[PDB]
């Protein structure tokens, strides 16, 4: 509930059944932590007439928006203050029968920058220990020709020019 | 020449002084405690701890640079000081 | 109208993002290719640039004068079970077959547990004396902080 | 590179995660493969934790700050209580100059009259 976005709720009993209505059925089987029990969708569902009663009585009802065939299926709330007035609260989508609350673009930024800042701070605090400074030595970590080659060189050249390598 | 070296010493001194003063002013800039908004509390807390750590490191580096400048001035004056050299010679 | 400024802010933030990513990659490659004689000055300098500019730029390009990013509903269109050139040139040599392992890798939100324990001890440190000293100490420290900065800035004239 | 590989781990790992961050943002500039849609939401506060915790930024990280400032200060106060002293006695007897960046002296009786080259 506090961090329900990371929780994954699965149930292999209803995996073989997967169609347009089976998404709503699997989401609303019983006692789903993601699916509120006191929702108004129940009131429409148990008796009959699952067509229009969502917009009639006051409540937050569940309707699909985008449905791609194999796995992904999106579930949308509408809080019904008045008919033809759509306001959503939370976002849901299932992938391979695994329900997920769709995060915002803000809290994911929060989590990634938290991880990045923690990693960089850890690396910096670990790197602090290696340097030692002294005003005389500086910084550190814990862990000739006698000008006669202007002749001997010539002799060598006279030697090389007269004795080529034999390889 | 000699004007370039001395003006380089002046540049180093003024740069380090303004750097340490600016660093302390920015430390007090982030020192105002206020109310948050869309900033993800733990993230900026950790990275402001990080910033004050690196700024304290900058302060230490500034002190070490001043020490190096003092040593260089000490070397310079003794070597080229005509008056000091003469006194030793006459004694 | 919100969408236009959303897109402009988007492009600004991704520009600073690309800057930060080049900063990190250049720092790593410089560390490796230049493990000659490396020193504590240059690494404290690298960290400062990484901290000061990238941090402060992105932080002010987020929390002022913006359409609000914590709105957006995140809802991809399909699953792409195959290797699209879209990915390889959109992302410069990454993004393997988009699948049920990288749907959550993309859309993960739960952080590491160490900061969760930190939040537990935040509840703990809130369990101490409060509701009379929180606001009181904000008042006091705010006032004397401001007095300090005033005094130090005042005398450079 | 046996030393600094642990920092290398922390930084390449942070690099891969921020690569994943540039990845999610690369799909954030996208209206193909994924659509954007804004609707707002709410988050009630538990406390005035920005300030409170900022005060801990002073406690914790200004304690780290003051610690490192006092640690530099104790290192230096120890350090101050030898090269530049010896240069005095040498310059007091012999004859020295600085050219380029090294320090050079003379032996010859040359300022005193000789012309032996």
Short mmCIF file of C-alpha atoms in Angstrom, two decimals:
data_model
loop_
_atom_site.label_atom_id
_atom_site.label_comp_id
_atom_site.label_asym_id
_atom_site.label_seq_id
_atom_site.Cartn_x
_atom_site.Cartn_y
_atom_site.Cartn_z
CA UNK A 1 0.00 0.00 0.00
CA UNK A 2 2.78 2.41 0.95
CA UNK A 3 4.93 1.27 -2.01
CA UNK A 4 2.44 -0.91 -3.89
CA UNK A 5 4.04 0.01 -7.23
CA UNK A 6 6.82 -2.53 -6.67
CA UNK A 7 4.48 -5.29 -5.48
CA UNK A 8 3.51 -7.84 -8.13
CA UNK A 9 0.24 -9.78 -7.80
CA UNK A 10 -0.07 -12.93 -9.93
CA UNK A 11 -2.40 -15.92 -10.07
CA UNK A 12 -1.90 -18.85 -12.45
CA UNK A 13 -5.49 -20.08 -12.07
CA UNK A 14 -6.89 -17.56 -14.58
CA UNK A 15 -3.92 -17.46 -16.98
CA UNK A 16 -5.55 -19.70 -19.67
CA UNK A 17 -8.61 -17.41 -19.80
CA UNK A 18 -7.52 -14.15 -21.46
CA UNK A 19 -9.85 -12.01 -23.57
CA UNK A 20 -11.38 -8.52 -23.50
CA UNK A 21 -13.56 -9.17 -20.45
CA UNK A 22 -11.07 -11.54 -18.83
CA UNK A 23 -8.77 -8.61 -18.04
CA UNK A 24 -11.50 -6.95 -15.96
CA UNK A 25 -12.43 -10.34 -14.49
CA UNK A 26 -8.86 -11.24 -13.47
CA UNK A 27 -8.29 -7.77 -12.03
CA UNK A 28 -11.50 -8.09 -9.99
CA UNK A 29 -11.57 -11.75 -8.95
CA UNK A 30 -11.41 -11.27 -5.16
CA UNK A 31 -9.18 -9.67 -2.49
CA UNK A 32 -6.67 -8.20 -4.94
CA UNK A 33 -4.37 -5.75 -3.11
CA UNK A 34 -4.37 -3.65 -6.29
CA UNK A 35 -8.17 -3.84 -6.67
CA UNK A 36 -10.21 -1.92 -4.09
CA UNK A 37 -12.95 -4.08 -2.58
CA UNK A 38 -15.37 -1.20 -1.88
CA UNK A 39 -15.28 -0.02 -5.51
CA UNK A 40 -18.54 0.70 -7.33
CA UNK A 41 -17.66 -1.77 -10.11
CA UNK A 42 -18.81 -4.60 -7.84
CA UNK A 43 -22.30 -3.08 -7.56
CA UNK A 44 -22.61 -3.16 -11.34
CA UNK A 45 -21.03 -6.61 -11.61
CA UNK A 46 -22.71 -9.05 -9.21
CA UNK A 47 -26.36 -8.55 -10.14
CA UNK A 48 -26.65 -7.86 -13.91
CA UNK A 49 -26.45 -5.05 -16.49
CA UNK A 50 -22.73 -4.39 -16.82
CA UNK A 51 -23.38 -1.89 -19.64
CA UNK A 52 -24.51 1.52 -18.38
CA UNK A 53 -24.74 1.46 -14.56
CA UNK A 54 -21.10 2.62 -14.29
CA UNK A 55 -22.09 6.17 -15.27
CA UNK A 56 -25.40 6.13 -13.37
CA UNK A 57 -24.41 5.77 -9.71
CA UNK A 58 -21.66 7.81 -8.07
CA UNK A 59 -18.38 5.93 -7.84
CA UNK A 60 -15.02 5.17 -9.38
CA UNK A 61 -15.46 2.67 -12.21
CA UNK A 62 -12.95 0.73 -14.30
CA UNK A 63 -12.83 0.91 -18.10
CA UNK A 64 -10.16 -0.19 -20.58
CA UNK A 65 -8.51 2.38 -22.83
CA UNK A 66 -5.89 0.61 -24.97
CA UNK A 67 -5.87 -3.13 -25.64
CA UNK A 68 -3.10 -4.78 -27.65
CA UNK A 69 -3.87 -8.41 -28.33
CA UNK A 70 -1.16 -10.73 -26.85
CA UNK A 71 -0.30 -9.53 -23.33
CA UNK A 72 -0.61 -5.83 -22.46
CA UNK A 73 -4.00 -4.52 -21.33
CA UNK A 74 -4.65 -1.13 -19.72
CA UNK A 75 -7.16 -0.40 -16.92
CA UNK A 76 -8.36 3.15 -16.25
CA UNK A 77 -10.40 4.62 -13.41
CA UNK A 78 -13.08 7.28 -13.70
CA UNK A 79 -14.37 9.03 -10.60
CA UNK A 80 -17.97 9.89 -11.43
CA UNK A 81 -18.94 13.15 -9.78
CA UNK A 82 -21.28 13.67 -12.74
CA UNK A 83 -21.86 11.73 -15.96
CA UNK A 84 -19.61 12.62 -18.92
CA UNK A 85 -16.97 13.88 -16.46
CA UNK A 86 -13.75 11.85 -16.46
CA UNK A 87 -11.07 12.20 -13.78
CA UNK A 88 -8.60 9.35 -13.12
CA UNK A 89 -6.80 8.51 -9.88
CA UNK A 90 -4.36 5.65 -10.57
CA UNK A 91 -3.11 3.86 -13.66
CA UNK A 92 -3.05 0.11 -14.26
CA UNK A 93 -1.72 -2.19 -16.96
CA UNK A 94 -1.14 -5.94 -17.20
CA UNK A 95 1.77 -7.54 -19.08
CA UNK A 96 1.64 -11.35 -19.48
CA UNK A 97 -1.03 -11.39 -16.79
CA UNK A 98 1.12 -9.40 -14.34
CA UNK A 99 -0.67 -6.32 -13.01
CA UNK A 100 1.34 -3.11 -12.52
CA UNK A 101 0.36 0.36 -11.37
CA UNK A 102 1.80 2.71 -13.97
CA UNK A 103 4.13 5.22 -12.28
CA UNK A 104 4.24 8.92 -13.00
CA UNK A 105 7.13 10.69 -14.71
CA UNK A 106 8.05 12.31 -11.39
CA UNK A 107 8.62 9.55 -8.85
CA UNK A 108 10.65 7.45 -11.29
CA UNK A 109 12.91 10.49 -11.71
CA UNK A 110 13.10 10.59 -7.91
CA UNK A 111 14.15 6.94 -7.63
CA UNK A 112 16.76 7.09 -10.40
CA UNK A 113 18.35 10.28 -9.09
CA UNK A 114 18.33 8.79 -5.58
CA UNK A 115 20.24 5.74 -6.82
CA UNK A 116 22.66 7.88 -8.86
CA UNK A 117 23.37 10.28 -5.98
CA UNK A 118 23.87 7.39 -3.55
CA UNK A 119 26.29 5.65 -5.90
CA UNK A 120 28.34 8.77 -6.60
CA UNK A 121 28.43 9.72 -2.91
CA UNK A 122 29.58 6.20 -2.01
CA UNK A 123 32.32 6.28 -4.65
CA UNK A 124 33.50 9.71 -3.46
CA UNK A 125 33.54 8.72 0.21
CA UNK A 126 35.50 5.58 -0.65
CA UNK A 127 37.95 7.59 -2.77
CA UNK A 128 38.54 10.10 0.04
CA UNK A 129 40.64 7.66 2.08
CA UNK A 130 43.44 7.18 -0.47
CA UNK A 131 44.90 10.71 -0.61
CA UNK A 132 47.51 12.01 1.82
CA UNK A 133 49.12 15.45 1.67
CA UNK A 134 52.24 16.92 3.26
CA UNK A 135 53.52 20.48 2.71
CA UNK A 136 57.00 19.14 1.88
CA UNK A 137 56.38 15.85 0.04
CA UNK A 138 53.16 16.80 -1.76
CA UNK A 139 50.27 14.44 -2.51
CA UNK A 140 50.42 10.65 -2.64
CA UNK A 141 48.36 7.49 -2.19
CA UNK A 142 48.43 5.01 0.68
CA UNK A 143 48.43 1.92 -1.54
CA UNK A 144 74.54 11.33 -19.17
CA UNK A 145 76.52 12.16 -22.35
CA UNK A 146 80.09 13.50 -22.45
CA UNK A 147 79.57 15.03 -25.90
CA UNK A 148 81.81 12.52 -27.69
CA UNK A 149 79.00 10.77 -29.53
CA UNK A 150 79.66 13.23 -32.36
CA UNK A 151 82.53 10.93 -33.24
CA UNK A 152 81.81 7.44 -31.90
CA UNK A 153 78.54 7.64 -33.81
CA UNK A 154 80.50 8.24 -37.02
CA UNK A 155 82.67 5.19 -36.41
CA UNK A 156 79.55 3.08 -35.87
CA UNK A 157 78.14 4.42 -39.15
CA UNK A 158 81.42 3.55 -40.84
CA UNK A 159 81.06 0.17 -39.19
CA UNK A 160 77.47 -0.42 -40.25
CA UNK A 161 78.17 0.88 -43.76
CA UNK A 162 80.97 -1.66 -43.89
CA UNK A 163 79.38 -4.54 -41.98
CA UNK A 164 75.71 -5.13 -42.91
CA UNK A 165 73.70 -7.50 -40.68
CA UNK A 166 73.43 -11.02 -42.07
CA UNK A 167 69.88 -12.04 -41.16
CA UNK B 1 60.92 38.43 -17.75
CA UNK B 2 60.00 39.28 -14.15
CA UNK B 3 56.73 41.20 -14.56
CA UNK B 4 54.98 38.08 -15.87
CA UNK B 5 55.98 35.95 -12.88
CA UNK B 6 54.88 38.56 -10.34
CA UNK B 7 51.58 39.21 -12.10
CA UNK B 8 51.06 35.44 -12.15
CA UNK B 9 51.57 35.42 -8.38
CA UNK B 10 49.01 38.22 -8.04
CA UNK B 11 46.54 36.31 -10.24
CA UNK B 12 46.98 33.14 -8.18
CA UNK B 13 46.48 35.00 -4.90
CA UNK B 14 43.34 36.85 -5.98
CA UNK B 15 41.89 33.74 -7.64
CA UNK B 16 42.34 31.63 -4.52
CA UNK B 17 40.97 34.35 -2.22
CA UNK B 18 37.83 34.87 -4.29
CA UNK B 19 37.46 31.09 -4.63
CA UNK B 20 37.47 30.45 -0.88
CA UNK B 21 35.18 33.42 -0.22
CA UNK B 22 32.76 32.33 -2.97
CA UNK B 23 32.79 28.76 -1.65
CA UNK B 24 31.89 29.90 1.87
CA UNK B 25 29.15 32.17 0.51
CA UNK B 26 27.65 29.27 -1.44
CA UNK B 27 27.87 27.08 1.67
CA UNK B 28 25.74 29.68 3.43
CA UNK B 29 23.56 29.91 0.29
CA UNK B 30 22.55 26.27 0.65
CA UNK B 31 22.33 26.75 4.44
CA UNK B 32 18.83 28.24 4.41
CA UNK B 33 16.39 25.60 5.63
CA UNK B 34 13.02 25.87 3.89
CA UNK B 35 10.01 23.81 2.80
CA UNK B 36 10.36 21.31 -0.03
CA UNK B 37 8.35 20.98 -3.24
CA UNK B 38 8.76 18.25 -5.93
CA UNK B 39 12.41 17.66 -4.98
CA UNK B 40 12.32 14.11 -3.52
CA UNK B 41 13.71 14.87 -0.04
CA UNK B 42 16.29 12.10 0.40
CA UNK B 43 17.86 12.77 -3.01
CA UNK B 44 18.70 16.42 -2.44
CA UNK B 45 19.64 15.69 1.16
CA UNK B 46 22.23 13.17 0.02
CA UNK B 47 23.54 15.32 -2.82
CA UNK B 48 23.76 18.44 -0.63
CA UNK B 49 25.78 16.39 1.86
CA UNK B 50 27.88 15.49 -1.19
CA UNK B 51 28.19 19.15 -2.23
CA UNK B 52 29.26 20.36 1.21
CA UNK B 53 31.78 17.52 1.34
CA UNK B 54 33.33 18.48 -2.00
CA UNK B 55 33.25 22.16 -0.99
CA UNK B 56 35.12 21.42 2.24
CA UNK B 57 37.60 19.56 0.05
CA UNK B 58 37.86 22.71 -2.09
CA UNK B 59 38.53 24.75 1.07
CA UNK B 60 41.36 22.41 2.06
CA UNK B 61 42.78 22.61 -1.46
CA UNK B 62 42.67 26.41 -1.24
CA UNK B 63 44.63 26.35 2.01
CA UNK B 64 47.23 24.05 0.47
CA UNK B 65 47.55 26.35 -2.55
CA UNK B 66 48.18 29.31 -0.23
CA UNK B 67 50.90 27.28 1.49
CA UNK B 68 52.53 26.58 -1.87
CA UNK B 69 52.39 30.28 -2.76
CA UNK B 70 54.04 31.20 0.55
CA UNK B 71 56.86 28.74 -0.11
CA UNK B 72 57.40 30.13 -3.62
CA UNK B 73 57.55 33.70 -2.30
CA UNK B 74 60.09 32.59 0.31
CA UNK B 75 62.29 31.08 -2.42
CA UNK B 76 61.99 34.13 -4.68
CA UNK B 77 62.94 36.83 -2.20
CA UNK B 78 66.08 35.15 -0.86
CA UNK B 79 67.55 34.44 -4.31
CA UNK B 80 67.14 37.89 -5.91
CA UNK B 81 67.35 40.23 -2.90
CA UNK B 82 70.31 42.54 -3.51
CA UNK B 83 70.24 44.15 -0.05
CA UNK B 84 70.15 40.86 1.89
CA UNK B 85 73.03 39.44 -0.14
CA UNK B 86 75.24 42.44 0.56
CA UNK B 87 74.92 42.20 4.33
CA UNK B 88 76.13 38.60 4.32
CA UNK B 89 79.05 39.56 2.09
CA UNK B 90 80.20 42.37 4.38
CA UNK B 91 80.08 40.17 7.48
CA UNK C 1 -0.88 24.84 -24.62
CA UNK C 2 0.64 22.78 -21.81
CA UNK C 3 2.00 20.30 -24.38
CA UNK C 4 4.18 22.88 -26.15
CA UNK C 5 6.00 24.01 -23.01
CA UNK C 6 6.09 20.36 -21.94
CA UNK C 7 8.00 19.55 -25.13
CA UNK C 8 10.36 22.52 -24.79
CA UNK C 9 11.16 21.59 -21.18
CA UNK C 10 11.53 17.97 -22.32
CA UNK C 11 14.20 18.94 -24.83
CA UNK C 12 16.03 21.16 -22.33
CA UNK C 13 16.12 18.39 -19.71
CA UNK C 14 17.30 15.78 -22.22
CA UNK C 15 20.04 18.18 -23.35
CA UNK C 16 21.31 18.45 -19.78
CA UNK C 17 20.85 14.66 -19.49
CA UNK C 18 23.11 14.08 -22.50
CA UNK C 19 25.58 16.50 -20.90
CA UNK C 20 25.59 14.52 -17.62
CA UNK C 21 25.95 11.22 -19.47
CA UNK C 22 28.91 12.52 -21.45
CA UNK C 23 30.38 13.80 -18.17
CA UNK C 24 30.17 10.35 -16.58
CA UNK C 25 31.45 8.49 -19.64
CA UNK C 26 34.32 10.93 -20.15
CA UNK C 27 35.26 10.66 -16.48
CA UNK C 28 35.37 6.85 -16.64
CA UNK C 29 37.34 6.77 -19.90
CA UNK C 30 39.75 9.43 -18.62
CA UNK C 31 40.28 7.41 -15.43
CA UNK C 32 41.14 4.36 -17.53
CA UNK C 33 43.08 5.82 -20.50
CA UNK C 34 44.88 8.24 -18.15
CA UNK C 35 45.88 6.11 -15.19
CA UNK C 36 49.20 7.80 -15.78
CA UNK C 37 50.22 9.87 -12.74
CA UNK C 38 46.64 10.83 -11.82
CA UNK C 39 46.26 13.20 -8.87
CA UNK C 40 43.82 14.29 -6.19
CA UNK C 41 43.37 17.84 -7.64
CA UNK C 42 42.07 16.67 -11.02
CA UNK C 43 39.64 14.17 -9.51
CA UNK C 44 38.28 16.67 -6.99
CA UNK C 45 37.87 19.02 -9.96
CA UNK C 46 35.99 16.42 -11.99
CA UNK C 47 33.65 15.71 -9.09
CA UNK C 48 32.99 19.42 -8.55
CA UNK C 49 31.94 19.97 -12.17
CA UNK C 50 29.78 16.84 -12.04
CA UNK C 51 28.19 17.98 -8.79
CA UNK C 52 27.87 21.73 -9.11
CA UNK C 53 26.73 22.29 -12.65
CA UNK C 54 24.85 19.10 -13.60
CA UNK C 55 23.09 18.95 -10.21
CA UNK C 56 22.09 22.62 -9.97
CA UNK C 57 21.14 22.97 -13.66
CA UNK C 58 18.83 19.94 -13.69
CA UNK C 59 17.40 20.83 -10.28
CA UNK C 60 16.35 24.32 -11.31
CA UNK C 61 15.22 23.18 -14.77
CA UNK C 62 12.86 20.85 -12.91
CA UNK C 63 11.34 22.65 -9.90
CA UNK C 64 10.56 26.08 -11.34
CA UNK C 65 8.58 27.39 -14.33
CA UNK C 66 7.53 24.01 -15.68
CA UNK C 67 4.55 22.02 -16.80
CA UNK C 68 4.32 19.28 -14.22
CA UNK C 69 6.11 15.99 -14.96
CA UNK C 70 4.64 14.15 -11.96
CA UNK C 71 1.36 14.09 -13.90
CA UNK C 72 2.25 11.92 -16.85
CA UNK C 73 0.48 8.58 -17.29
CA UNK C 74 3.01 6.10 -18.63
CA UNK C 75 1.42 3.69 -21.13
CA UNK C 76 3.47 2.19 -23.98
CA UNK C 77 1.67 1.14 -27.14
CA UNK C 78 2.79 -2.45 -27.82
CA UNK C 79 5.46 -5.04 -27.08
CA UNK C 80 8.17 -5.19 -29.76
CA UNK C 81 9.41 -8.83 -29.60
CA UNK C 82 11.98 -8.17 -32.30
CA UNK C 83 15.04 -6.08 -33.11
CA UNK C 84 13.91 -2.77 -34.60
CA UNK C 85 16.26 -0.25 -36.20
CA UNK C 86 14.22 2.38 -34.36
CA UNK C 87 15.85 1.14 -31.14
CA UNK C 88 19.42 0.75 -32.39
CA UNK C 89 19.68 4.24 -33.89
CA UNK C 90 17.31 5.94 -31.44
CA UNK C 91 19.42 4.70 -28.52
CA UNK C 92 22.93 4.25 -30.04
CA UNK C 93 23.67 0.57 -29.62
CA UNK C 94 21.55 -0.74 -26.75
CA UNK C 95 17.97 -1.86 -25.99
CA UNK C 96 17.79 -5.63 -26.67
CA UNK C 97 14.50 -7.36 -27.50
CA UNK C 98 11.83 -5.38 -25.62
CA UNK C 99 10.22 -7.99 -23.40
CA UNK C 100 8.74 -8.88 -20.00
CA UNK C 101 12.14 -8.59 -18.30
CA UNK C 102 12.73 -5.03 -19.52
CA UNK C 103 9.13 -3.80 -19.24
CA UNK C 104 9.73 -3.68 -15.44
CA UNK C 105 13.40 -2.76 -15.86
CA UNK C 106 12.12 0.30 -17.70
CA UNK C 107 9.16 0.84 -15.35
CA UNK C 108 10.78 -0.02 -12.02
CA UNK C 109 9.98 2.31 -9.13
CA UNK C 110 10.92 0.53 -5.90
CA UNK C 111 14.38 1.80 -4.83
CA UNK C 112 17.07 -0.12 -2.99
CA UNK C 113 16.19 -1.21 0.58
CA UNK C 114 18.90 0.83 2.33
CA UNK C 115 17.01 4.07 1.77
CA UNK C 116 13.87 2.24 2.89
CA UNK C 117 15.57 1.53 6.21
CA UNK C 118 16.65 5.18 6.18
CA UNK C 119 12.97 6.15 5.86
CA UNK C 120 12.19 3.80 8.76
CA UNK C 121 14.69 5.74 10.86
CA UNK C 122 13.11 8.93 9.53
CA UNK C 123 9.86 7.76 11.12
CA UNK C 124 11.97 6.96 14.19
CA UNK C 125 13.54 10.43 14.37
CA UNK C 126 10.08 11.90 13.86
CA UNK C 127 8.94 9.82 16.86
CA UNK C 128 11.10 12.07 19.07
CA UNK C 129 9.94 15.44 20.41
CA UNK C 130 8.05 17.22 17.64
CA UNK C 131 5.18 19.61 16.81
CA UNK C 132 6.77 22.23 19.11
CA UNK C 133 10.43 22.17 18.03
CA UNK C 134 10.27 21.58 14.27
CA UNK C 135 8.79 24.98 13.39
CA UNK C 136 10.57 26.68 16.31
CA UNK C 137 13.99 25.52 15.15
CA UNK C 138 13.20 26.38 11.52
CA UNK C 139 12.43 29.93 12.69
CA UNK C 140 15.59 30.24 14.79
CA UNK C 141 18.07 28.71 12.34
CA UNK C 142 16.53 30.53 9.36
CA UNK C 143 16.83 33.87 11.15
CA UNK C 144 20.41 33.48 12.32
CA UNK C 145 21.54 31.94 9.01
CA UNK C 146 20.11 34.99 7.25
CA UNK C 147 21.79 37.33 9.76
CA UNK C 148 25.13 35.59 9.17
CA UNK C 149 24.96 35.86 5.38
CA UNK C 150 23.85 39.50 5.67
CA UNK C 151 26.81 40.36 7.89
CA UNK C 152 29.44 38.57 5.81
CA UNK C 153 28.15 39.92 2.46
CA UNK C 154 27.60 43.41 3.87
CA UNK C 155 31.26 44.23 4.53
CA UNK C 156 32.72 43.76 1.04
CA UNK C 157 31.70 47.32 0.08
CA UNK D 1 44.64 -1.17 -12.18
CA UNK D 2 44.18 -3.48 -9.17
CA UNK D 3 43.67 -0.37 -6.98
CA UNK D 4 40.72 1.93 -7.78
CA UNK D 5 38.76 -0.98 -9.26
CA UNK D 6 36.22 -0.80 -6.43
CA UNK D 7 35.52 2.85 -7.23
CA UNK D 8 35.46 1.63 -10.84
CA UNK D 9 32.72 -0.85 -9.90
CA UNK D 10 30.61 1.78 -8.12
CA UNK D 11 30.99 4.17 -11.06
CA UNK D 12 30.40 1.70 -13.90
CA UNK D 13 27.34 0.42 -12.00
CA UNK D 14 26.08 3.96 -11.49
CA UNK D 15 26.91 4.44 -15.18
CA UNK D 16 24.74 1.50 -16.26
CA UNK D 17 21.85 2.69 -14.12
CA UNK D 18 22.08 6.24 -15.47
CA UNK D 19 22.32 4.70 -18.94
CA UNK D 20 18.98 3.09 -18.07
CA UNK D 21 17.89 6.58 -17.02
CA UNK D 22 18.86 8.07 -20.38
CA UNK D 23 17.02 5.04 -21.79
CA UNK D 24 13.74 5.79 -20.03
CA UNK D 25 14.13 9.45 -21.05
CA UNK D 26 14.88 8.32 -24.62
CA UNK D 27 11.49 6.64 -24.51
CA UNK D 28 10.13 9.80 -22.83
CA UNK D 29 10.87 11.93 -25.90
CA UNK D 30 8.81 9.33 -27.74
CA UNK D 31 5.26 9.40 -28.98
CA UNK D 32 5.84 6.24 -31.00
CA UNK D 33 6.31 2.95 -29.09
CA UNK D 34 4.60 4.78 -26.20
CA UNK D 35 2.24 7.70 -25.65
CA UNK D 36 2.51 10.46 -23.05
CA UNK D 37 -0.57 11.61 -21.15
CA UNK D 38 -0.74 14.07 -18.21
CA UNK D 39 -3.13 13.69 -15.25
CA UNK D 40 -2.15 14.95 -11.81
CA UNK D 41 -2.19 13.31 -8.38
CA UNK D 42 -1.63 14.00 -4.68
CA UNK D 43 0.88 13.18 -1.94
CA UNK D 44 0.00 14.23 1.62
CA UNK D 45 3.02 15.05 3.84
CA UNK D 46 3.95 13.03 6.94
CA UNK D 47 5.91 15.89 8.52
CA UNK D 48 7.89 18.99 7.61
CA UNK D 49 10.70 16.63 6.63
CA UNK D 50 12.46 18.92 4.06
CA UNK D 51 13.53 21.32 6.79
CA UNK D 52 13.95 18.72 9.50
CA UNK D 53 16.11 16.56 7.32
CA UNK D 54 17.95 19.66 5.97
CA UNK D 55 18.90 20.37 9.58
CA UNK D 56 20.30 16.85 9.48
CA UNK D 57 22.17 17.85 6.33
CA UNK D 58 23.81 20.32 8.69
CA UNK D 59 24.17 17.77 11.54
CA UNK D 60 25.41 14.87 9.39
CA UNK D 61 27.10 16.47 6.40
CA UNK D 62 28.20 19.70 8.06
CA UNK D 63 29.64 17.42 10.72
CA UNK D 64 31.50 15.69 7.92
CA UNK D 65 32.40 19.15 6.62
CA UNK D 66 33.58 20.54 9.98
CA UNK D 67 35.31 17.21 10.58
CA UNK D 68 37.31 17.49 7.35
CA UNK D 69 38.02 21.20 7.97
CA UNK D 70 39.26 20.41 11.48
CA UNK D 71 41.12 17.38 10.09
CA UNK D 72 42.96 19.51 7.56
CA UNK D 73 43.57 22.01 10.35
CA UNK D 74 45.01 19.40 12.72
CA UNK D 75 47.16 17.94 9.93
CA UNK D 76 48.57 21.40 9.17
CA UNK D 77 49.00 22.51 12.82
CA UNK D 78 50.96 19.30 13.35
CA UNK D 79 52.90 19.76 10.10
CA UNK D 80 54.23 23.25 10.82
CA UNK D 81 55.58 22.30 14.26
CA UNK D 82 63.68 22.60 6.22
CA UNK D 83 64.70 22.95 2.58
CA UNK D 84 64.31 26.74 2.54
CA UNK D 85 66.50 26.99 5.65
CA UNK D 86 69.52 25.25 4.12
CA UNK D 87 69.30 27.45 1.03
CA UNK D 88 70.12 30.37 3.34
CA UNK D 89 73.50 29.08 4.55
CA UNK D 90 74.44 27.96 1.04
CA UNK D 91 73.52 31.37 -0.38
CA UNK D 92 75.44 32.97 2.49
CA UNK D 93 78.74 31.39 1.52
CA UNK D 94 78.51 30.45 -2.17
CA UNK D 95 77.07 32.15 -5.23
CA UNK D 96 73.75 31.04 -6.73
CA UNK D 97 71.22 31.88 -9.44
CA UNK D 98 67.95 30.58 -10.88
CA UNK D 99 67.62 30.10 -14.64
CA UNK D 100 64.79 28.21 -16.25
CA UNK D 101 63.52 26.29 -13.24
CA UNK D 102 66.66 24.87 -11.61
CA UNK D 103 69.21 26.37 -9.23
CA UNK D 104 72.83 26.77 -10.29
CA UNK D 105 75.99 27.95 -8.56
CA UNK D 106 79.59 28.79 -9.41
CA UNK D 107 83.01 27.56 -8.32
CA UNK D 108 85.45 29.47 -10.49
CA UNK D 109 87.68 32.31 -9.32
CA UNK D 110 86.12 34.26 -12.13
CA UNK D 111 84.35 37.16 -10.47
CA UNK D 112 87.57 37.52 -8.44
CA UNK D 113 89.93 38.04 -11.37
CA UNK D 114 90.79 34.85 -13.28
CA UNK D 115 90.19 34.48 -17.03
CA UNK D 116 91.04 30.79 -17.28
CA UNK D 117 88.15 29.70 -19.52
#
